[PDB]
Design a protein around this ligand. Structure first.
Ligand SMILES: CCS(=O)(=O)NCc1ccc2c(c1)OCO2
Ligand SMILES: [Zn+2]
Ligand SMILES: [Zn+2]
Ligand SMILES: [Zn+2]
Length: 572
């Protein structure tokens, strides 16, 4: 039990026994913690507990030292010093924010605000504590058991009594029993095995609670600015395609780390892959939280970089189908594409972390711990969607609080900004530029005259809490008959239950706003479904309308966002 203080690094024998992570706290900090919170169990070699037989005094403020032993006020010998005196807790080698991180239930937005405005070591304490709290919460849900097997994609489930039922969306991944990971959608339920298996009756499913490893590396390394490009060797022969990013690629070699804010369709993949063509000898590890973000980087690399110098790292516990054109699990290749949780312990000349709004501080820290690099480039957009915070139910998490990188991009600004959207028709670019980009995003395409908006509240029904608006889907069905070109549109809504209804009624492929992020489609049909804080989130709204290359039909519930859409209004 010999470690360093999470608040001031001072070496100590003390750990908080009431904290779920049991942080090492020094004499002067440990006191400031026990004296201000319900946390009174202090751990050393032995806990600070009354040594008198059958005594239940564990509160450090009610204990004293009797020689080399610990006793309460009722058992202490005449010659005994209190454990808590003069701003310190007795220990070898002799905070308001730490108390709030240590005691909070992570259900308030203010908990996440603090976990991002605090000191660097407190961001790791916050990130570990949050993730451990999120896992112990997965145990609170009831066990689903197979009652009947309808077919290869449908079954009926028997839930546990006394324990609540977890939300049934793709976000919540189950573990069958060890028959593989499984997912559910809406008494006929749709089952989806990450592995194909003849669903047996009696088999059960649990949300896999994974052990939270402690954090060691910071979320962001200390910034270093250099007079020249360091450890990287630029080409003089640089393809005209990537000439627009040359000044920014040099900025990347003259700093330890750099932030790139790239609104939708401004060239993030192009910038990331073009950085390899600019430093041709440099080993680049490409990382992101999701398999789809890593796969999008592989698709752009397949087009510009040699396939023999690339490798897609796939964890043996495969959950979804990912990129198959590179040699798999060769961490020895010059270009390594890998999700954060699968990263090996290696080194790199450049580390590119894409879709930075989806990262948590836990992920930022894991990347710094597994990858030791000369340069780190963080690419994403704080105006796009963050990682879901399953415990957060009160308050809204603002972009400057998503993670350390997003905090920097929203306060000091990003080091680099891609200001030209090449994907969207001008109507959409002008709407999101004013909405989330402070009028700094510019349109490359002209107005398509195929961006429509309809103010139609319809009727809101609910599959549990996931919302449906059948009259909004009815308006879409009516529109499709009059606009058959839109037969090829992707249907998007903020709710998976709305999507299930629209899939059966319209037959269009379906995507939630959160799963559509990073993807593009010629035509998009968006139904807002509700006027909630979720369906009105400006970041979700921004993602939803920036998926479209040619046209979009927005069936709106919120007068506010409807009025902001610079689209042609439709009647009915
Ligand atoms: C951080 C660089 S690395 O260790 O991942 N790649 C270098 C390398 C090492 C051994 C090899 C090889 C390439 O090809 C044959 O055997
Ligand atoms: Zn301390
Ligand atoms: Zn504590
Ligand atoms: Zn006692």
């Amino acid at each position: 039990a010999v470690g360093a203080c999470v608040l001031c690094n001072s070496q100590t024998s003390l750990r908080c026994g009431a904290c779920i992570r049991r942080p090492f706290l020094c004499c002067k900090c440990c006191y400031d913690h026990v004296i201000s919170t319900s946390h009174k169990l202090v751990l050393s070699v032995n806990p600070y507990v009354c040594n008198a037989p059958g005594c239940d005094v564990t509160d450090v403020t009610q204990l004293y030292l009797g020689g080399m032993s610990y006793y309460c006020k009722s058992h202490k010998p005449p010659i005994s010093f209190p454990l808590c005196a003069n701003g310190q807790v007795f220990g070898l080698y002799k905070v308001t924010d730490f108390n709030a991180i240590a005691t909070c239930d992570w259900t308030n937005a203010g908990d996440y605000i603090l976990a991002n405005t605090c000191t660097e070591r407190l961001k790791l304490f916050a990130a570990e504590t949050l993730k451990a709290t999120e896992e112990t919460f997965k145990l609170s849900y009831g066990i689903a058991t197979v009652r009947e097997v309808l077919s290869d994609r449908e079954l009926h489930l028997s839930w546990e009594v006394g324990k609540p039922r977890p939300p049934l969306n793709r976000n919540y991944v189950f573990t069958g029993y060890q028959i593989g990971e499984y997912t559910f959608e809406k008494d006929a339920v749709v089952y989806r095995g990450t592995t194909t298996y003849k669903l047996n009756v009696g088999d059960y499913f649990v949300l896999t609670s994974h052990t939270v490893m402690p954090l060691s590396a910071p979320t962001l390394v200390p910034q270093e600015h250099y007079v020249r490009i360091t450890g990287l060797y630029p080409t003089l022969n640089i393809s005209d395609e990537f000439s627009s990013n040359v000044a920014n690629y040099q900025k990347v070699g003259m700093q330890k780390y750099s932030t790139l804010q790239g609104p939708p369709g401004t060239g993030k993949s192009h910038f990331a892959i073009g950085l390899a063509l600019y430093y041709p000898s440099a080993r680049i590890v490409y990382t992101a939280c999701s398999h789809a973000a890593v796969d999008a980087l592989c698709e752009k690399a397949l087009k510009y970089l040699p396939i023999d110098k690339c490798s897609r790292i796939i964890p043996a516990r495969a959950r979804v189908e990912c990129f198959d054109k590179f040699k798999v699990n060769s961490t020895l290749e010059q270009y390594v594409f890998c999700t954060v949780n699968a990263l090996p312990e290696t080194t790199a000349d450049i580390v590119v972390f894409d879709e930075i709004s989806m990262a948590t501080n836990y992920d930022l820290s894991v990347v710094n711990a597994r990858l030791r690099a000369k340069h780190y480039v963080y690419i994403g957009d704080p105006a796009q969607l963050p990682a879901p915070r399953t415990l957060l139910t009160k308050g809204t998490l603002e972009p400057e609080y998503f993670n350390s990188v997003c905090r920097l991009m929203k306060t000091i600004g990003p080091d680099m900004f891609l200001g030209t959207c090449r994907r969207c028709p001008a109507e959409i670019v002008d709407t999101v530029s004013a909405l989330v980009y402070d009028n700094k995003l510019k349109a490359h395409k002209d107005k398509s005259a195929q961006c429509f908006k309809m103010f139609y509240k319809g009727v809101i029904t609910h599959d549990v809490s996931s919302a449906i608006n059948r009259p909004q889907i009815g308006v879409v069905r009516e529109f499709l008959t009059r606009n058959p070109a839109w037969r090829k549109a992707v249907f998007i809504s903020p709710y998976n239950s709305q999507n299930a209804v629209a899939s059966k009624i319209l037959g269009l492929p379906t995507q939630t706003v959160d799963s559509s992020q990073g993807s593009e489609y010629d035509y998009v049909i968006f139904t807002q479904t509700t006027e909630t804080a979720h369906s009105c989130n400006v970041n979700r709204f921004n993602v939803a309308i920036t998926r479209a290359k040619v046209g979009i039909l927005c069936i709106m519930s919120d007068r506010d966002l409807y009025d902001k859409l610079q689209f042609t209004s439709l009647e009915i």
